[model samples]
Target: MEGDNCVFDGVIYRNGEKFEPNCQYHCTCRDGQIGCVPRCQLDVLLPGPDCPAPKKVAVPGECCEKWTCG
Candidate 1:
């Protein structure tokens, strides 16, 4: 029996390859070996969650006059 945190049934690869546990994409071992790989991006890799850049906000002169920087 395997202890807690022990990996089983999963292939391992050498370092500098792309792989992530519990991740759907890029779930393949490298060089037919069993080891942890580096977080590298592959040509067929899919994009993950994206976050847009913050937008610039402008305050009107009237609003600024009545508003205070708290």
Candidate 2:
């Protein structure tokens, strides 16, 4: 899974800890008022700012700079 096949440029973290980018689980906002359970985009490693909340999780990671598909 190295070389060209590796699409991920950085790691995915939760609560200051790194989790497998492809891990299947729910990511509930710490505030408890909102949550993104049943994460719809787990296995498919598509890169882009098209995902919801583009300004937060995706943009800081440079997801917008590299992605071409939309």
Candidate 3:
């Protein structure tokens, strides 16, 4: 592994490369280290229990799922 590159899960990423491990998070390979940040808030007030149903949909080019109910 290079000194400035990052290795994760046997995959090599260049420094400053996007290192997102999953949805809802954005990570970066920074000079041999990886860091991640949340793309969406942990608490989302979509409609609460007042709504009969609560659902989410995954769409293209979006990190966080979209709320479909309420």
Candidate 4:
């Protein structure tokens, strides 16, 4: 089923195994394979006006640009 660990291509992979595609982002296994996306988009409200400058960060499981107060 979905979320269950399995063997593919003779390699045992878990449901959420970390799969780095490069140095910019990483992915996860959705059915014993790296098919998920990385988190990058802004899902939450942007930092407040008083908040420090935000930085773009790559979050796993979400394939979009994300901002962080850092």
Which one is best on TM-score?
Answer: 3
Instruction: List the lowest-lDDT window of 10 residues for candidate 1.
Output: 61-70
lDDT by residue (tens digit), candidate 3, 1-70: 4559888888998998996777778888988998888888565545666765666777689877777664
Q: Positional deviation of 24 in candidate 4, in angstroms?
A: 2.6
Evaluated against the true structure, the overall lDDT of model 2 is: 0.34
Lowest lDDT 10-mer window, candidate 4? 36-45
Per-residue lDDT tens digits of candidate 4, residues 35-54? 64544443565567876677
Each model's TM-score, in the order given? Answer: 0.18, 0.16, 0.54, 0.31
State candidate 4's TM-score: 0.31
- State candidate 2's TM-score: 0.16
Candidate 4 global lDDT: 0.63
Give the distance in Å from residue 54's predicted Cα in candidate 1 to where it truly belongs: 26
> lDDT score, residue 11, model 1?
48
lDDT of 2 at 57: 35
- Among the numbered candidates, top lDDT falls to 3
Candidate 3's displacement at residue 34, Å, is: 0.3
Instruction: Tell me the whole-model lDDT of each prediction, alpha carbons only.
Output: 0.37, 0.34, 0.78, 0.63
